[PDB]
């Protein structure tokens, strides 16, 4: 696990040199955007049960064979383990947004998840559809003002969509 | 009846030249997706009856072609449909593996729209069945594999139109 | 080399096994154990992760106010169709001709078809080489 | 051509056309 | 599943021994009760449709807000009403599985494991399903030891929801 | 009908119709008055023959109507009785045609492909037609019940 | 599998009152009924040794013969003697003792960015040997709820039902 | 295939007699062609030409 | 295959959803489970209504005549000090 | 692990259906056998030491290289492990007899066993000879009268012989 | 487009294309970058250009939406806006084709026969397109509004 | 009679959708080659008579179709050829500008091979004249422009075959 500040130190250490003056100033822009990064994460964890349940509900409307008898999310236990997966991925996407680096997301969430679903028989193409529904439910709740001052958070919601896309590709 | 390798060899042979960098460049592109196509053709073989049952129930199950007078009324006529939809889901699987839609018009498309007009089979409801069948096929094989299998469904729908 | 994995070297059970009852030892390696999985490099200055300093939000409807050979190209263009089009504009309005025949579609549907392109029917002239 | 067979005219059927509300 | 047969194999398997006479008596007691159990499962199946449409109506009579309130969780649409009667039929089907098997093993595996997490997530109320199961307990029409076996698995579902 | 396949039989054999074929077309058309009376009984008894037909079908096969059965709910049960109205109609055609040729190419040819492809238990729909048969033969005399029941059991045979 | 169908509220009560230790709590979770239903009944004797070495001892199986060597403890002594033998190894008592909850020991090297694929992801509850028996399906021939009029939900291009909630907005407004 | 234009009762006479090895291929084809499944499809709706 | 399972005639081991073959023991494919129902008679066309397989008009004989006899000239041959493990 | 009764429930839950009326009548015949299915399990449990030892002694008389030095059943620890394996396969066959279904037998005993004996060097063609000798010792002991009333148990010893044949072809 | 009818013009005349024709195909393709930007503005403004288009149409022609008007009720008003979405789409084609040739053979040829045969006042639909034109030209600069408005008024001319 | 823009608009219109990124992606590809096609059509207009004079002298000038009895003997018949070859070099110029061969079969290909069989015009010598005419056209307009103009010549030769 390393964040965005520790990744420029880990790369400068394998060169054996101090950080430059333009590498400190690029990190001072990331400190000035810190309060707006803290309100992306505050909005996706204060609505964590609404991102997951409304996107699950939209998935079995679109792919209704998953809840048919014999299906993949058919029982009470396979339905609860399905919502467990959507809640785990949203947890580690939110961990990667407060860090600025997708290191914790693929060290301990995406590490071997594609081959877990192949040994189980879970369709990884439908898990990717479920992540893409949690993505735009999260970027729509990110760029609404509603208790935040008005400004430009445009490059922060582009980064948040990048961890959602990294998780959806890495699963199928 | 040519696959991606057969089509690449034909075009490189038809000019009498060897397989240069451009011909092998596409062949390497086909071998990269070779792993994706087999798993796509794997699950489609498993859920063949389930996919066709999902498409007809989602597109034309309760429409009035299903009722008396509609084009699908009698049990012989209904049974011909799922027999007929099986070829579209099957031959599309062949195109997905071969990476070339030459097998479709060779063995499916030619004399097809000219045959449905003879029987009076509605081409409009047929394409929507294949479109719905394309929609469920993207469910199983995933997104990009659905993009591959879906690329031959609308090829059937285009020529059958 | 060594023994195979797990086999205590020297306590093999296939030492003096008969050939008639010998069973071939299956092959097993140290792959599926977790100690031999390849980790990220991370001492050569490379971590496999991704975060901030990666993601860029590129505006690609809006590259810039588009290049000068699209506007300078352009304003030449409709200086050369402007005289065309308004000649073709009120060629429509007081071309307000009367009506022949019976209305075959509601109240319209008369002799000529509405707004039909005359260049198509009139542009394909049949010609006889050595016309006679 | 049989005890159940299709003719176009007796088809009274929004399936050659596809207004999906019927 | 948890049957009377597999809880006898498991008792002998948990110590690595053969099936003694302790375990043959438990399997024999399953065979004596199975005559009343397989006639209750046959009778709940034979009147299942008239028991499900009645029990869904008993929920709408007691909790009439579920047919009027807008929202996804409620039966205020034709799609929400079909999903309500789908759930009553899930609870009735597991009861006739427990009568066939002979223990509370099918509905432990398919229904009650993970049920509290669904009702919290999708905003369903366990008092809707208790009222639906109290209808079936009073309206299946059985009597004798046939009704004793049917009510023993209906009361198992009411105790997990409450 | 008996008229059309007694023709296509003698058609294939390059010959005309024998006395064995023409004394039965003759014998069938004199039977035609009695056939329309039999079909007339089943025509306006479909309300009872179908509804009591699905009566015994659910009492004998509660699985198909129970939750999980194919005909579960208000919707499928209506279609559950719709098919019985179909097959009761085809039996009226077979009685007037004097053969299961109308029932053959409608509701019998490839019927297992349809019901297998619909998820319906084909044995269950066979049980439904048998329940209709006892209601139908209970509406007619013994001389007629040997016919009206006779076409049902052919449908029972081909439906399994 | 942390559900309240699988909670052990009386093992929890004896741990809060200092009657049992954490080594007895860890033993009681392996011998519990949810662990035998969801895990032991869907593995053979060899893959279940791999699950219980990775989760109790905190380390990976050495080779495929360690799996063979320990799977005969389950077949002859049952599951209760296998977890007594595992918990009484010196590998366990030197690392966790009887008071520490186990963990995956030495998963990640100190300066690296990646790890070693944590053990709940490396072995899920069933694998390839039970996949062809208990795997679910798509399109199950299951007779679900119907839809009856699918083209009215998503209209086509020239349909004036795409302009239907525009006549309300303009009105005579 | 026989599926969508047979009833099931037509040529199981010939299949089981052939699966058992009692008749070779040519008898199986000749008995197939001279069954009423064939003339119901290839002889009835077409002329002799 | 779905009809045979739905009719309770016999369950046919098919494929899992990705297309690997089903099997109860993971060695070979299409192995099935057995027990208390494949040896029980009288239900062969079970759930196929009014099925008529074999002499349905009579209960079969008990046939509980288990004895192995000396099979002269056809006792099977196999090596000595050896098990004929198959090639 | 599921019995004959839970097998038809698991097959009907994959369709999401109630049980048919012929499926319940075929389960009432398994209840009617009953008392005599329990006679077969009682007769091969009361003789389980002699099924194993008499068919072990018969195995090393026909295949004497198994106990020659270098053979697989030559040492004290290797001989006691051959008798331990015969007693385990006999244990899970009697579990599958009382359950009416070979699901305890090929999940707990037969799954993965062919590939295990190959990793150890154990000749799986000779394990199959020792299983087929326990089959003849069990079916000759299943149909003897000896304290049971006279009747027809022929369809139940055809099922007991079928479990022994399943364990003997899945070991090699 | 300008490319296809500059060809079929010189096609009929048995000749190649003059400098007057080839210096405008040249001048049009360099104009192509600016055309896609203009059509890109109208592409994802159809929500406002159509809905505000029908805004002024009903305020200027309340007869067509009043009871008795052709677009009366929830139904016809939806189709009342559907046609405006059509004609707004064809203007995006004409801007990219650099001519009303796409608008000519779609929505203009024989348009009076359709709307007369549908009972729709053709003058009313002409008023609708004019209301869309003021919304469209209000979304673009003066150099662009001389084009986007330029294709609407051609549609106004042919629609009466 | 559709150009590349007309064909792109038709396919995007025939599904009732707007011009998405894929439809405009091909349109941008056509506008990039807009500069090449005009200069290609420029020089072909200049050297129209020179190209046809080069093709006939290089393919069928001295063959025995030119001699008595051959298909091109009389002066009316010879004069019909260069009149006939002018259309192939002219209509191919239109396809090169429009970027779509729809105009060829609309105005050249239909009833063409059925007409030459009526007159008895040798289709074999006709295609080789167009092939030789394609060879000289690659001389003038260059390589890639010759690839563009050449792409419609063999389209005529294919359908005329
Ligand atoms: C513990 C939790 C915790 C937080 C959530 C933040 C909360 C927070 N945010 C801002 C401050 C801000 N927050 C935003 C954010 C946004 N404005 C928008 O329109 C978007 C919807 C959203 C992007 C995510 C912006 C743009 C500012 C700066 C306002 C400005 O432009 O001056 C400030 C004032 C300091 C400053 O202005 O820099 C504080 C305290 N800080 C915390 O300590
Ligand atoms: C009844 C007949 C019968 C046989 C012939 C042998 C056949 C045989 N030989 C070996 C085994 C072997 N055989 C050799 C053979 C040779 N060593 C060399 O260097 C030369 C190539 C050659 C000497 C002439 C060697 C080295 C091994 C040991 C292999 C090893 O342990 O890696 C093995 C494996 C088991 C073991 O370790 O012994 C078997 C079955 N066994 C039998 O039961
Ligand atoms: C003597 C007066 C004089 C001028 C004012 C310029 C005017 C000018 N600008 C450009 C052309 C250009 N000039 C720029 C430059 C820039 N775009 C930006 O946003 C930055 C502010 C800046 C770079 C730092 C770009 C990007 C183009 C290309 C425009 C295009 O995309 O077509 C060109 C065409 C090619 C070129 O020479 O660049 C000309 C002649 N040249 C002159 O000779
Ligand atoms: C220890 C296990 C155990 C049981 C089986 C039952 C024991 C048991 N079995 C039978 C009853 C029986 N047991 C048998 C069994 C057999 N007869 C033979 O000749 C065969 C050798 C053998 C079958 C393999 C038969 C056939 C009957 C029924 C009697 C009959 O059919 O005549 C009865 C009489 C009850 C009745 O018939 O109603 C009882 C108590 N209880 C137990 O605790
Ligand atoms: C913290 C990091 C982490 C991740 C990411 C993780 C994933 C994970 N998901 C699992 C199961 C599952 N995952 C799903 C999910 C789905 N099925 C569907 O059909 C849907 C498309 C989809 C979600 C809606 C289901 C249903 C199961 C249960 C499979 C089963 O037990 O049969 C399992 C199986 C193990 C078990 O249930 O005991 C693991 C290890 N585990 C982890 O520890
Ligand atoms: C491999 C390429 C290939 C195809 C596709 C093919 C089609 C084909 N479809 C047929 C009939 C049919 N096809 C249908 C199909 C339909 N009815 C509807 O309403 C739907 C729109 C549609 C299902 C999607 C029906 C009902 C018939 C029977 C027509 C009749 O009996 O008159 C027939 C007549 C003979 C027969 O079915 O035995 C052929 C040959 N043949 C081929 O070789
Ligand atoms: C086999 C074991 C099993 C059970 C028990 C089960 C329950 C279950 N019921 C659900 C929904 C539902 N359940 C209801 C039922 C009701 N709401 C009402 O107002 C009525 C009073 C009541 C009927 C008694 C409704 C309306 C929904 C849809 C809620 C939603 O879509 O969010 C859902 C959400 C997924 C879906 O939409 O299908 C699950 C998982 N699923 C299972 O697989
Ligand atoms: C004239 C010959 C003929 C027949 C027989 C026929 C059957 C037929 N049965 C259907 C559905 C159906 N049929 C059933 C039937 C049953 N459910 C049960 O439990 C019972 C066992 C059984 C009835 C006794 C059900 C539940 C459906 C709806 C299935 C679904 O919605 O998925 C459908 C699709 C919907 C429709 O168009 O009606 C057809 C075409 N069509 C024909 O032309
Ligand atoms: C799934 C239920 C299950 C079974 C059946 C099982 C068998 C099993 N048999 C083993 C060994 C063995 N098995 C045999 C058996 C035989 N060799 C012969 O020559 C005879 C043909 C045959 C006896 C009839 C022998 C000799 C060993 C010892 C191998 C050794 O010492 O290396 C071992 C290695 C551990 C040990 O015994 O020390 C296991 C795990 N394990 C299980 O978990
Ligand atoms: C792309 C060129 C093009 C056009 C323009 C077009 C028009 C068109 N307008 C229609 C209906 C209609 N159009 C209107 C229109 C109006 N009512 C008013 O009051 C206003 C004056 C006016 C709209 C601004 C109404 C009310 C109907 C329904 C008429 C009816 O239901 O009888 C219909 C029949 C239903 C349908 O298929 O949509 C067509 C085909 N089709 C085309 O392909």
PDB file of C-alpha atoms in Angstrom, chain A residues 4 7-8 14 27 30 100-103 155 158-159 163 166, chain C residues 42-53 55-57:
ATOM      1  CA  UNK A   4       0.369   9.322  -4.427  1.00  0.00           C
ATOM      2  CA  UNK A   7       4.777   6.685  -5.169  1.00  0.00           C
ATOM      3  CA  UNK A   8       6.882   9.669  -6.227  1.00  0.00           C
ATOM      4  CA  UNK A  14      15.288   3.755  -7.361  1.00  0.00           C
ATOM      5  CA  UNK A  27       2.672  17.792  -4.681  1.00  0.00           C
ATOM      6  CA  UNK A  30      -2.340  17.926  -4.423  1.00  0.00           C
ATOM      7  CA  UNK A 100      -4.532   8.902  -4.999  1.00  0.00           C
ATOM      8  CA  UNK A 101      -3.026   5.571  -6.031  1.00  0.00           C
ATOM      9  CA  UNK A 102      -4.748   2.331  -6.987  1.00  0.00           C
ATOM     10  CA  UNK A 103      -2.281   0.266  -4.966  1.00  0.00           C
ATOM     11  CA  UNK A 155     -10.362  16.214 -12.644  1.00  0.00           C
ATOM     12  CA  UNK A 158     -12.341  11.697 -13.700  1.00  0.00           C
ATOM     13  CA  UNK A 159      -9.892   9.974 -11.360  1.00  0.00           C
ATOM     14  CA  UNK A 163     -10.631   3.260 -10.311  1.00  0.00           C
ATOM     15  CA  UNK A 166      -9.824  -0.471 -13.335  1.00  0.00           C
TER      16      UNK A 166
ATOM     17  CA  UNK C  42       9.248  -2.483  -6.208  1.00  0.00           C
ATOM     18  CA  UNK C  43      12.983  -2.386  -5.499  1.00  0.00           C
ATOM     19  CA  UNK C  44      13.811  -1.421  -9.078  1.00  0.00           C
ATOM     20  CA  UNK C  45      11.605   1.636  -8.574  1.00  0.00           C
ATOM     21  CA  UNK C  46       8.354   0.300 -10.014  1.00  0.00           C
ATOM     22  CA  UNK C  47       5.126  -0.430  -8.207  1.00  0.00           C
ATOM     23  CA  UNK C  48       2.277  -2.072 -10.063  1.00  0.00           C
ATOM     24  CA  UNK C  49      -0.382   0.203  -8.549  1.00  0.00           C
ATOM     25  CA  UNK C  50      -2.161   3.268  -9.949  1.00  0.00           C
ATOM     26  CA  UNK C  51      -3.626   6.356  -8.307  1.00  0.00           C
ATOM     27  CA  UNK C  52      -3.275  10.110  -8.381  1.00  0.00           C
ATOM     28  CA  UNK C  53      -0.735  11.420 -10.941  1.00  0.00           C
ATOM     29  CA  UNK C  55      -5.716   9.887 -14.130  1.00  0.00           C
ATOM     30  CA  UNK C  56      -6.195  12.776 -16.537  1.00  0.00           C
ATOM     31  CA  UNK C  57      -9.612  14.182 -17.387  1.00  0.00           C
TER      32      UNK C  57
END
